[PDB]
RNA sequence: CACCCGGUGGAUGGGCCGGGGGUGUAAGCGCCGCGAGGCGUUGAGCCGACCGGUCCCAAUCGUCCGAGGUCUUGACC
RNA sequence: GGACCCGGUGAAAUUGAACUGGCCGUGAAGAUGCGGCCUACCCGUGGCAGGACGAAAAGACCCCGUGGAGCUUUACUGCAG
RNA sequence: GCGAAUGCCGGCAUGAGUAACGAUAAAGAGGGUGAGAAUCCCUCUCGCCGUAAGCCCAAGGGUUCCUACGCAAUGGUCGUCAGCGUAGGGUUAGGCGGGACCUAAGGUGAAGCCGAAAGGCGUAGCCGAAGGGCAGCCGGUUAAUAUUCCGGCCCUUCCCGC
RNA sequence: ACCGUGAGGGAAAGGUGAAAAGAACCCCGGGAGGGGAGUGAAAUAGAGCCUGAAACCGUGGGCUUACAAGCAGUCACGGCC
RNA sequence: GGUCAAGAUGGUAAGGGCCCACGGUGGAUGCCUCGGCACCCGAGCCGAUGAAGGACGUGGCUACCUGCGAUAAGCCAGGGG
């Protein structure tokens, strides 16, 4: 619900900051398609585009920072524009799998 | 052959005993894996009571690899008899129970 | 909750100390009962 | 509140015999992928980096 | 858990893409009225699993275990 | 949101002991353990309550001890006033 | 001279690696330290208060407060974090509060009054309080104090002299 | 010490050795704790460290275990050791 | 030498039950003592020249135990050494 979004908001945020992150499995399987998706927007790249991924990201700077930074450097593939690796360790106490994922570059 | 141990160690004899029960009777160098990737805490320690075995021959024991561990095994004794909340009356301890870890570690 | 123990300086003091105690007949008893008998301290002590 | 409680002292034997169908089973790891040495099957490390491309350190 | 299909000589996830379905014509500029609003562009916009394309992405590489063919009698080649 | 799978921790009353099946019969008269019989591999985890006369508590209902304790009146006696 | 008294005392197994983490006001990411960090430090998104999950005066508890070292156990997991350990250090007032003033209840209580003894009562006087009364305030200043320490501004009572 | 506001209740816990000569140094390790050397008559006498039994948890070995009932078991006959 | 058809014994144990060896956990136990218990002979009052009993207190460097208390591990005089 308001927390399923929250994250991939977060997510979604910091990533395209640095473009592949530390999250679990899963957490990332998803910040992906989304963050993703979000990205294919910063590639419809205008007024609307913009109007909506900020209308999630909130944020400047970014927000305009991917449609023109990154956008570009994607523009000619077909989604995908992250690789979600898996990891080799796990978070103590826990033992969750993480695994990383980042912008296919 | 040379032997790795440690009493006064806290934690779940149980579960330790699993951790050998795997890595046991093998290959130095192998387990040194196993217990280096495998998960459940008890490993890390475990490690260790490998390491200053392995050690402890090679140096005052006496042929590095060729070595594995013949026999592993862990025993219970003293308890930490723990205190809870009062049957909301009377008292009810459980026992982190101590934990004592030895292990061989003899040459092929 | 309101157990039946806030401790009142003001109180449990008065009430009870060494005086008091003392002042009595009783009270004396016991005490110098307390004193020997056990050794200890005693109350307003307390 | 404790309406059902075990009723006879387990019998060790048993008992244990329960706790019997446990047991591990050590990671399934494999080998480096150059990082020559053994790895968590499917996963670069504090050995590797690699995978085909170098995202880690060291 | 066991059970089913797939493991880049792949369409298995996602992604994208067409397709459907679904909400009722958007963000903007435009033109009428002091304003409120309206009318237009514009059945727009946006689309969660539904039908199906395309190697953008991500199932790399690797291990382990596994047969041999038990004793007697006879029936045939 | 627990419950389930992971990792870290890790109790608790009751319990002689136990590898504890159904039957129809039985015995102190409502038996997994005795007889005859029929099904019957070894262990487990997620459950569902029926039986183990399940747990709680040496029945408060009962009677029995020429037990006890409280109130009652033209019970006995005695004191206070 | 002991199974054996739901016996007493001590240990030790049970159920059981299942039941619980003390409010369904959630988090997640980047860097940093460390032998080792979901659980510490900095930083950036996010959620919960907001009549409180605010500061304040009391009462109660008394070093729990700061600073440098450290994690064996207590922290219902960790833990380099602590309101945990050791060591050092911290809270100053003519004017704030209590007394150096006042009495009601009440308590004491020379005299006085009655008890088998211990005792009972009890005048005046005394004890007795955020009730009465009384002479200040704002800023600064350390790891902690502050109407007390700084300083600027405002006072009171006693004493000696004239 | 500790529960009790109070009057009051009221525990547990002794033992290395001849004496410390009480373990310098080197080793794995963040340490505790474990491997050697040295004291030594002995340290499986080693710091809550004399004797240090049982219950109860382990590590290996012999035998034994998947058409099988009883805590028990004890009498017969058989194979492995 | 191969094929079919039948007929009967074996190995393999996740854990498990018994036997053996080696730990661990736990402290019984024996023997022992700076302590009691018990009975008998000694003794038999302390107090304002503020007792019995505490309070906070000095050791150079500190909680406790102690003996004192300000002239605080003690200051004078005589006997023993």
Redesign the pocket.
């Known amino acids: 619900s ?2 399923r979004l ?2 991939y ?3 979604a ?3 395209l ?2 473009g592949r ?4 499995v899963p ?1 990332a399987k998803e910040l ?3 963050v ?2 979000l990205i ?1 927007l910063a590639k419809r790249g205008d ?2 585009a913009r ?2 991924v900020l209308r999630d990201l ?1 944020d400047v700077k970014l927000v305009r920072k991917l449609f023109d930074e990154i956008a570009p450097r994607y523009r000619d ?10 990891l080799a360790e796990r ?6 799998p993480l695994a990383l994922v980042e912008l ?1 570059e | 052959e ?14 330790v ?1 699993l951790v050998v ?1 795997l890595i ?2 093998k290959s130095l160098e192998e387990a040194r894996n196993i217990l280096r990737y495998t ?4 490993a890390y320690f475990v490690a ?1 009571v490998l ?3 392995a ?3 090679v ?3 006496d042929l590095e690899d060729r070595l594995y561990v013949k ?12 205190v ?2 009062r ?1 909301r009356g009377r008292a ?7 934990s ?1 870890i ?1 292990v061989i570690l003899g040459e092929k | 909750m309101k157990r ?9 003091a008065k009430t ?1 100390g060494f005086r008091a105690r003392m002042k009595t ?1 009783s009270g004396r008893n ?1 005490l ?4 020997a ?7 307003v ?2 | ?23 591990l089973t050590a990671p399934n790891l ?2 480096c ?1 150059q990082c020559h040495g053994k790895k968590l ?3 670069i490390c504090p050995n590797c980096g690699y ?2 491309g170098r995202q880690v350190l060291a």
Request: proline share 4%; net charge positive; aromatic share 4%.
């Open positions: 308001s927390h929250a994250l908001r977060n997510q945020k910091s990533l900051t640095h992150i530390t999250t679990t957490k992906r398609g989304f993703d998706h294919h007024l609307h109007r909506l909130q593939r077909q989604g995908g524009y992250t690789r979600v690796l898996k978070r103590r106490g826990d033992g969750a296919v | 040379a032997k790795a141990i440690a009493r006064y160690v806290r934690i779940s004899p149980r579960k005993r029960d046991r009777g998960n459940k805490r008890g260790k390491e200053s075995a050690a402890n021959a140096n005052n024991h026999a592993a095994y862990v025993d219970e004794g003293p308890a930490l008899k723990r809870l909340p049957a009810d301890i459980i026992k982190k129970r101590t004592h030895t | 039946t123990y806030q401790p009142n300086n003001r109180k449990r009870h007949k016991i110098a009962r307390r004193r008998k056990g050794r200890h301290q005693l109350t002590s307390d | 509140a404790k309406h059902p409680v075990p009723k006879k002292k387990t019998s060790k034997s048993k008992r244990d015999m329960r706790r019997s169908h446990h047991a494999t080998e992928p099957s499917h996963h995978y085909d």
